Amino acid sequence: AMTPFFWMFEEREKMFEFYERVSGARMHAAYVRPGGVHQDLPLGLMDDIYEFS
């Protein structure tokens, strides 16, 4: 089947956006540490996860 690959990855790119806004980078984010999260997530992401989800 051809399309549900393309039909979902076109939508999936709304969600690799969310890694870049919080950690800094595209896929492999060195974010979690052995003492919790590295740094705080910016002003936002709750009007943008909520519009997404």
Binding site: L41, L43, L45, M46, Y50, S53
Partner: protein
């Protein structure tokens, strides 16, 4: 003191699963089909029978000549 979560404004979105729209089923189909097909054969016997009449006219012009 500049932190995220709002005091209000929420949905949520559903977890549900529904699109069962019917759909013209259950003796409604097999009734439009046969009713369409019998209109076809009724549209035959008015053309295939009529072409058989013009067919004999086509042989008629042959036989009135050839002595």
């Amino acid at each position: 003191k500049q932190d995220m979560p709002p005091v209000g404004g929420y949905g949520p979105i559903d977890y549900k699963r529904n699109l069962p729209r019917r759909g013209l089923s259950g003796y409604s189909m097999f009734a439009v089909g046969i009713g369409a097909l019998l209109f076809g054969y009724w549209s035959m016997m008015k053309w295939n029978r009529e072409r058989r009449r013009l067919q004999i006219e086509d042989f008629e012009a042959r036989i009135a000549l050839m002595p």
